[PDB]
């Protein structure tokens, strides 16, 4: 319910964090 | 309930961290 | 229900985080 | 059913994340 | 229940780890 | 039954993973 | 059944990984 | 069936990651 929706919101933010981290890693690779 | 509010707070923080990493990645270009 | 759906979305996001962290490890190494 | 499927996908992601943590730990030294 | 508690604790830890990665990245970029 | 016991053991192991991940996040600071 | 047994096996493995990660983190702290 | 086998394979790999990480920790000291 409220917990499931908040976990979905957390998951989406975590996914976006992952993609930003990968972008940073790739910038470190030039 | 209390767990839902905590998860929302963590999501908020992750959004902020992701923006900073994207700024850092641009700085390395 | 929605809880299982949220757990599946959490799993996908955590998988993306795994790939991102590996990329960062690659960038640190070489 | 869908809950068992979600648990299995979550376990797989936990395993992949643990592998990445192990890889990251190796890279730190 | 305990699984919901565990997901919350793990989400909290992921968030703290994400902060630590962001700080590490900040140092690497100068 | 045995599934509920397995889920409880999984929840407790996930909490241990949470504790370890917070420990690792702190170790990146220093 | 076998799913619950395998989930218990996975939980034990996850606990062992968490302990190893915690040990690494605390060794990194010094 | 397939889910139980998957979980067992993940568990086997997880413990192997743990043993590698334990070795990394010992090398630090």
Number of Cβ atoms within 10 Å of the Cβ of E5: 15
First CA to last CA distance, chain G:
44
Would you state the structure tokens that stand for residue H22, as one six-digit string? 């334990």
Kindly give, in sequence order, each residue whose CB lies less than 8 Å from that of residue G18, ignoring residues fewer than 6 positions away.
Answer: F13, F16, F17, F19, F20, F21
d(CA C9, CA C3): 10
Technique that determined the structure: X-ray
Query: At what angle are helices B2-27 and E2-28 packed, to 10 degrees?
Result: 20
State the SS3 of H1-29. Answer: CHHHHHHHHHHHHHHHHHHHHHHHHHHHC
Contacts of H2 (CB under 8 A, 6+ apart): none
Tokens in use for F9? 């053991």
Residues of chain G found within 8 Å of residue D4, distances taken between Cβ atoms: 3
* Phi, psi torsion values for D9, nearest 5 degrees: -65, -40
Chain D residues inside the 8 Å CB shell of C28: 24, 27-28
Pick B28's closest partner by Cβ from E12, E15, E29.
Answer: E29
DSSP output for G7-27: HHHHHHHHHHHHHHHHHHHHH
H or E element in which residue D17 lies:
helix D2-27
Q: How many residues does chain A have?
A: 30
Q: What chains are in contact with F, requiring at least 3 Cβ pairs below 8 Å? A: D, E, G
* Euclidean distance between CA atoms A17 and E17, whole angstroms: 11
Measured CA to CA, the distance from residue C7 to residue A7 in angstroms comes to 8
How far is residue G7's CA from residue F5's CA, in Å, rounded to a whole number? Answer: 10
- Establish if C17 touches chain E: CB-CB under 8 angstroms: yes
Q: Are H13 and G15 in contact (CB under 8 A)?
A: no
Touching status, chains E and H (3+ beta-carbon pairs under 8 Å): no
> Which residue among A3, A10, A14 sits closest to E4, beta carbon to beta carbon?
A3
Mutate to test the interface with G, among F9, F21, F25 (most CBs of G within 10 A): F9
Resolution for this model in angstroms, one decimal place?
Answer: 1.7
Q: For residues E7 and F14, is the Cβ–Cβ distance under 8 A?
A: yes
């Amino acid at each position: 319910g409220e917990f499931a929706q908040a976990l979905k919101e957390f998951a989406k933010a975590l996914k976006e964090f992952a993609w930003a981290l990968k972008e940073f890693a790739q910038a470190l690779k030039g």
